[PDB]
Amino acid sequence: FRKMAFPSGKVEGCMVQVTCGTTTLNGLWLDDVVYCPRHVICTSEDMLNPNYEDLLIRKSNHNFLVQAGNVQLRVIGHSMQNCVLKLRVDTANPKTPKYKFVRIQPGQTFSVLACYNGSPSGVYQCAMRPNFTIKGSFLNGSCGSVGFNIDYDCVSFCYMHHMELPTGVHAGTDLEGNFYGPFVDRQTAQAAGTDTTITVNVLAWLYAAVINGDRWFLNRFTTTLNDFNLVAMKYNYEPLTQDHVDILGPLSAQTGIAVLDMCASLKELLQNGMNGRTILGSALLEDEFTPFDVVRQCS
Amino acid sequence: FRKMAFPSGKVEGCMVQVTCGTTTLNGLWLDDVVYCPRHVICTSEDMLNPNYEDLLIRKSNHNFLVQAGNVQLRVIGHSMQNCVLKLRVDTANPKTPKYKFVRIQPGQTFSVLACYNGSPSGVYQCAMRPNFTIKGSFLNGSCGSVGFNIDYDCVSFCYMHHMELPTGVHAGTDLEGNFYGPFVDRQTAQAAGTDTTITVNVLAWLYAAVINGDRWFLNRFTTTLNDFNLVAMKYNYEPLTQDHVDILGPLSAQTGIAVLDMCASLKELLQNGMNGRTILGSALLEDEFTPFDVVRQCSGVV
Ligand SMILES: CC(C)(C)[C@H](NC(=O)C(F)(F)F)C(=O)N1C[C@H]2[C@@H]([C@H]1C(=O)N[C@H](C=N)C[C@@H]1CCNC1=O)C2(C)C
Numbered sequence: 001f002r003k004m005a006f007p008s009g010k011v012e013g014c015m016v017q018v019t020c021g022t023t024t025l026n027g028l029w030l031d032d033v034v035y036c037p038r039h040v041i042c043t044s045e046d047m048l049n050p051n052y053e054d055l056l057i058r059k060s061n062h063n064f065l066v067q068a069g070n071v072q073l074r075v076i077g078h079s080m081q082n083c084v085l086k087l088r089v090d091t092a093n094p095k096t097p098k099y100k101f102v103r104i105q106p107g108q109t110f111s112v113l114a115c116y117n118g119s120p121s122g123v124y125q126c127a128m129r130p131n132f133t134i135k136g137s138f139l140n141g142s143c144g145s146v147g148f149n150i151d152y153d154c155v156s157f158c159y160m161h162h163m164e165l166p167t168g169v170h171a172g173t174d175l176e177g178n179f180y181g182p183f184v185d186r187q188t189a190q191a192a193g194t195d196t197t198i199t200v201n202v203l204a205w206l207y208a209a210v211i212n213g214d215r216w217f218l219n220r221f222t223t224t225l226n227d228f229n230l231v232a233m234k235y236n237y238e239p240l241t242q243d244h245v246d247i248l249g250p251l252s253a254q255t256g257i258a259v260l261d262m263c264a265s266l267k268e269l270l271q272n273g274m275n276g277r278t279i280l281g282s283a284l285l286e287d288e289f290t291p292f293d294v295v296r297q298c299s
Numbered sequence: 300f301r302k303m304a305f306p307s308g309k310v311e312g313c314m315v316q317v318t319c320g321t322t323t324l325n326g327l328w329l330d331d332v333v334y335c336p337r338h339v340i341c342t343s344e345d346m347l348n349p350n351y352e353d354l355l356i357r358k359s360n361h362n363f364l365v366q367a368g369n370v371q372l373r374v375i376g377h378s379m380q381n382c383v384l385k386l387r388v389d390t391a392n393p394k395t396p397k398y399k400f401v402r403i404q405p406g407q408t409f410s411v412l413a414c415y416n417g418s419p420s421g422v423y424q425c426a427m428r429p430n431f432t433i434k435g436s437f438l439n440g441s442c443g444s445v446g447f448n449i450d451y452d453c454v455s456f457c458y459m460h461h462m463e464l465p466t467g468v469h470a471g472t473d474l475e476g477n478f479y480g481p482f483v484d485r486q487t488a489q490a491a492g493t494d495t496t497i498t499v500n501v502l503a504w505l506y507a508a509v510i511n512g513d514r515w516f517l518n519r520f521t522t523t524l525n526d527f528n529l530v531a532m533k534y535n536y537e538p539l540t541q542d543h544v545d546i547l548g549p550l551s552a553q554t555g556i557a558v559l560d561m562c563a564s565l566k567e568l569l570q571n572g573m574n575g576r577t578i579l580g581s582a583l584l585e586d587e588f589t590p591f592d593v594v595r596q597c598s599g600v601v
Pocket residue numbers: 025039047138139140141142143144161162163164165166170184185186187188189190
């Protein structure tokens with residue numbers, strides 16, 4: 001049972017390089033617009049305390065160098081939408097897929113295509129954490145890499161990468177330029193809210209463990225939804241709603257384990273610990289598989 | 300530190316579907332040849348005990364339905380090479396990347412593009428285990444999905460998927476049709492052998508830890524390679540080869556920790572355990588990152 005990303009090719013054909021001065025990062029080229037993080041306009045010194053509207057008014061179209069592979073795209077217009085810059089170019093991208101911009105909910109997952117200098121580097125799956133950070137793998141020059149999901153050849157872009165917090169987690173925006181979380185695109189010490197664990201995802205993953213034949217954590221105890229939620233809150237787990245119970249329906253029907261029965265197992269896991277044992281090869285309870293991710297891989 | 304697959308676009312453009320009878324699986328379309336598992340020619344009853352040479356004699360070019368999407372590619376020739384079928388088609392794939400076929404060693408990792416009906420579905424990173432299985436995610440119809448690495452726009456194909464063993468792990472061939480491990484493409488009682496831990500990759504993981512400042516496990520001991528190999532096997536760890544010592548060269552140089560010093564550090568971990576501390580925030584020693592994977596992730600390769 002593996003974390004599985006979507007095939008990245010439809011996104012690869014959209015990645016370009018954007019340079020302003022000596023600051024270079026990635027952009028997303030859809031039709032005749034390139035989307036990229038607005039801090040491309042900052043000198044490394046500007047990033048310490050930027051006034052973006054002031055910085056942007058001092059730029060012309062010619063200050064932006066957009067490279068698609070070896071070919072330069074002429075910038076014929078620019079505007080800022082929140083923390084994203086939209087560069088109108090003189091060429092429409094022939095590989096533009098059917099796409100949508102979506103803002104995802106905490107606990108949902110997406111694939112990241114990490115890129116450097118407009119060139120794709122690697123692909124992996126992330127979840128939007130409850131504190132609105134992601135546990136990614138990004139280095140210098142990765143900004144403008146995007147997160148996405150793919151549904152019947154439609155790419156739903158949900159994340160553009162902007163920054164790494166001192167704890168090593170990552171923060172970014174939707175494609176309208178609005179940050180996930182209480183962060184700002186300024187080079188200054190920033191911390192996230194205390195994180196919490198995505199309960200419905202842990203349950204989905206326990207169902208995956210049972211499907212794959214691992215049942216040592218199961219029990220005969222029972223719990224009500226409210227009593228489970230009291231324990232979840234005590235252990236910094238997110239509340240489980242009735243909608244989550246409904247969403248876990250198919251996995252519950254497939255394994256014959258009632259949702260509240262799996263909740264009772266999780267409650268004892270939180271209260272007893274894992275006694276050094278593992279589940280699906282993991283020494284910790286995994287919360288980055290949604291119920292959808294689990295069904296898509298088991299079914 | 301996380302499992303990063305290669306971008307899959309160059310491989311997606313090569314995936315087709317191959318049907319013989321009612322059996323559909325995936326094929327790899329490079330230039331004017333489609334490569335696929337030979338059991339596409341079997342009926343469900345055939346797979347229980349197939350004679351591939353005679354079953355292939357009873358097939359002709361016009362028995363093979365090869366489709367890119369729903370577009371049929373006319374088959375103009377067929378041959379069998381080990382457990383792969385090679386179907387010559389009348390159209391050269393314009394999306395063919397620069398490519399090589401390679402046979403990998405246990406411990407080496409690769410990206411898998413899981414496909415169904417010729418349509419790519421997902422991508423993930425896999426390590427070839429010492430017992431010649433991969434811990435993959437493959438459902439019905441996944442056969443012919445491929446594994447690959449990339450280096451500077453050259454795709455090295457190393458795996459084609461054929462089967463699932465009862466423990467849930469997966470087995471297949473190189474692109475010349477030779478199985479990894481003792482497996483055969485027959486629906487017969489087969490089982491994965493006992494597995495071992497990939498020592499060279501654990502060591503790479505230890506170097507990755509050191510690079511990030513997590514180095515409590517660096518001890519004052521060293522060892523010889525032969526002494527280490529003999530002890531590691533008592534802990535179900537693979538012995539190191541000379542090639543393993545050399546592939547750890549770059550990480551040894553970057554950290555200044557000699558390979559045999561790191562072997563001595565790992566030996567102490569095996570002999571005394573962790574003692575309730577973690578490495579890279581884990582109580583388990585990870586063995587599915589190669590030394591190249593560590594450098595690839597810590598650098599910005601393409
Ligand atoms: C870690 C760094 C301290 C230097 C800083 N972080 C914080 O200032 C914080 F603490 F507020 F997060 C930070 O990320 N940036 C500083 C400057 C941009 C951003 C930045 O360099 N983005 C990179 C885009 N190519 C991706 C980074 C590089 C390392 N890994 C990544 O993911 C902006 C906020 C404008």
